[PDB]
Amino acid sequence: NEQCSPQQRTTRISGRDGLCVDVYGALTADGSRVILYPCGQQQNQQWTFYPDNTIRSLGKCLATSALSSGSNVVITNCDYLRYDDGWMVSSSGTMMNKSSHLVLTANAATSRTNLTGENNVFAAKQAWRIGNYVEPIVTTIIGLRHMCLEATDNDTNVWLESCVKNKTKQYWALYSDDTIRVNNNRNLCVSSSTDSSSKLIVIRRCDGSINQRWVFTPQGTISNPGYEAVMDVAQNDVYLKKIVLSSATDKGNGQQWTVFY
Amino acid sequence: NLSLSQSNFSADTYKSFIKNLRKQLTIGASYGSAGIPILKHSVPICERFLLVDLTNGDNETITLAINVEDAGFAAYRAADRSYFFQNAPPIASYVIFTDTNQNIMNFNNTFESIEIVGGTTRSETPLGIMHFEASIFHLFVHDENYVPTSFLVLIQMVLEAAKFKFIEQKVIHSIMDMEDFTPGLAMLSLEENWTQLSLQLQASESLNGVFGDSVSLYNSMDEPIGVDSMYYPILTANMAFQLYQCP
Numbered sequence: 001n002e003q004c005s006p007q008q009r010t011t012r013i014s015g016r017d018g019l020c021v022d023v024y025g026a027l028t029a030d031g032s033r034v035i036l037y038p039c040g041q042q043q044n045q046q047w048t049f050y051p052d053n054t055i056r057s058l059g060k061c062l063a064t065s066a067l068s069s070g071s072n073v074v075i076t077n078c079d080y081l082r083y084d085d086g087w088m089v090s091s092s093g094t095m096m097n098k099s100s101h102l103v104l105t106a107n108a109a110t111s112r113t114n115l116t117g118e119n120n121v122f123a124a125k126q127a128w129r130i131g132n133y134v135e136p137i138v139t140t141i142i143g144l145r146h147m148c149l150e151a152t153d154n155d156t157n158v159w160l161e162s163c164v165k166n167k168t169k170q171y172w173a174l175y176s177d178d179t180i181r182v183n184n185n186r187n188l189c190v191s192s193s194t195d196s197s198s199k200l201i202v203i204r205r206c207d208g209s210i211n212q213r214w215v216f217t218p219q220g221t222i223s224n225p226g227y228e229a230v231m232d233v234a235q236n237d238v239y240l241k242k243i244v245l246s247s248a249t250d251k252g253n254g255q256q257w258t259v260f261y
Numbered sequence: 262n263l264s265l266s267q268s269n270f271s272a273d274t275y276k277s278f279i280k281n282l283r284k285q286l287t288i289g290a291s292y293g294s295a296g297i298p299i300l301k302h303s304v305p306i307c308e309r310f311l312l313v314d315l316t317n318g319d320n321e322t323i324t325l326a327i328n329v330e331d332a333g334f335a336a337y338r339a340a341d342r343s344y345f346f347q348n349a350p351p352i353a354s355y356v357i358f359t360d361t362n363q364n365i366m367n368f369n370n371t372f373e374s375i376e377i378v379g380g381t382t383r384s385e386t387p388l389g390i391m392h393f394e395a396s397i398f399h400l401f402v403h404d405e406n407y408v409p410t411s412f413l414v415l416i417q418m419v420l421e422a423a424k425f426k427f428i429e430q431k432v433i434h435s436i437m438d439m440e441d442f443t444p445g446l447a448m449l450s451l452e453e454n455w456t457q458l459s460l461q462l463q464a465s466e467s468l469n470g471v472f473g474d475s476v477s478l479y480n481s482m483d484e485p486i487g488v489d490s491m492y493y494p495i496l497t498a499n500m501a502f503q504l505y506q507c508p
């Protein structure tokens with residue numbers, strides 16, 4: 001069978017604020033930088049993946065421009081990577097240079113923002129959705145006692161309420177930067193505590209930070225890889241109206257969650 | 262055997278049944294980069310079936326034989342009569358429900374063979390506790406008018422729910438709302454593509470989590486969503502286990 005070993009595939013890459021990985025003005029030359037840009041069908045946002053561990057747009061390979069942090073990510077000649085191990089992509093969508101360990105990062109959220117190789121801190125700005133469907137997935141998030149998450153107190157807080165179908169604030173838009181956003185107001189994000197004294201999960205303006213990166217794991221948890229912890233219901237009691245970040249434990253079902261779209 | 266009586270059929274109980282069903286199917290499962298279990302393969306016929314008991318409003322039970330390799334029904338027992346599909350493994354006859362009066366149904370366990378013979382699609386077959394119970398009865402007496410429709414219902418509510426958390430959650434909503442539903446495009450597209458998604462997701466190892474070909478999974482608004490990689494929450498936090506495909 002030669003369908004188990006597919007030789008290539010062309011697709012887009014989306015990330016911070018749902019903007020796409022884009023080589024600036026379709027420039028051919030080696031070292032031509034790569035940026036955030038609003039998503040479209042143009043040839044310079046098409047990324048073709050290969051068993052070579054390469055990611056190609058305009059017949060040229062995506063690559064970091066320095067061993068140090070802070071330098072641009074570029075496109076260049078694929079002949080120059082002749083004995084290079086290339087890119088590796090984690091389950092959570094962290095695109096990493098295998099040699100330097102630098103990770104694709106968008107240090108701002110606006111159009112024409114230079115993309116750089118930086119050190120991985122598991123931020124939202126370092127999370128990426130490889131795939132043609134770049135849109136936010138509008139969904140409900142069901143948890144303990146079959147209840148839906150709901151944005152509350154003027155989109156500042158979040159806890160469990162009983163699932164009402166029409167209800168606006170129970171719907172969440174899942175972005176390509178691993179962020180869980182309010183569907184009615186997509187400037188706002190689900191965020192872990194900024195205060196050290198609290199472990200309470202709250203809603204804040206999106207800022208590309210570690211606190212707002214969320215992975216929906218196959219084992220049914222909602223993981224924040226930076227803080228090595230998962231969303232949990234407080235004291236496994238939904239009526240306490242508090243969702244908290246906790247170390248992963250099979251004691252209880254407060255750390256089990258479903259996506260329903 | 263793992264059981265689900267309609268006399269004790271809550272959201273909590275249903276979920277516990279489905280959770281345990283997954284666990285038992287994923288014993289000895291292999292694991293890829295996605296972290297979603299892959300079912301066993303080349304399983305000797307003697308160990309290839311998992312028995313599950315479903316009881317109706319009369320305290321009368323059917324025992325279904327689930328092929329552990331693909332999570333489909335090979336046969337079922339009722340009192341001292343057993344009934345096999347044609348496409349069920351040829352040696353299954355000699356291994357399960359051995360001390361019964363065995364029959365071979367005149368069709369295959371696929372939805373296409375069932376819909377052809379039954380004369381009705383999944384789209385026009387309501388689902389729910391009321392229908393779950395009715396299907397167990399009709400399979401127990403084996404009224405052939407209803408046998409095909411009864412498999413549409415039970416395959417979807419047991420096996421396709423085990424496969425997909427979305428489908429599991431469709432049934433949970435129905436339990437708590439006390440209201441029937443006919444499967445939408447979202448549900449049917451997951452049933453359609455379970456086989457294909459298993460292939461692409463295992464081939465994806467080759468291309469850093471990227472598919473060989475896209476798979477259209479519809480949402481509840483009937484908008485298709487292309488899934489051409491492992492980086493979609495609607496695949497990753499939905500598909501519970503997958504069919505073996507690639508070494």
Ligand SMILES: *[C@@H]1O[C@H](CO)[C@@H](O[C@@H]2O[C@H](CO)[C@@H](O)[C@H](O)[C@H]2NC(C)=O)[C@H](O)[C@H]1NC(C)=O
Binds near residue numbers: 066067087
């Ligand atoms: C990953 O980064 C490593 C180091 O940052 C790159 O390997 C170097 O490439 C330069 C060109 O910029 C060569 O002249 C050096 O000899 C290489 N040095 C090392 C440390 O091997 C590699 O190009 C990058 N790969 C990708 C695909 O990004």
Ligand SMILES: OC[C@H]1O[C@@H](O[C@H]2[C@H](O)[C@@H](O)[C@H](O)O[C@@H]2CO)[C@H](O)[C@@H](O)[C@H]1O
Binds near residue numbers: 023024025042
């Ligand atoms: O500005 C980024 C944007 O460039 C577009 O390409 C432009 C380019 O900006 C301009 O300098 C050149 O003269 O014309 C090009 C074609 O309109 C790309 O279409 C887009 O993908 C971004 O890269």
Ligand SMILES: *[C@@H]1O[C@H](CO)[C@@H](O)[C@H](O)[C@H]1NC(C)=O
Binds near residue numbers: 347348369374
């Ligand atoms: C049943 O499956 C077999 C292969 O196992 C196939 O040849 C046949 O066409 C299928 N359908 C029917 C109605 O027999």
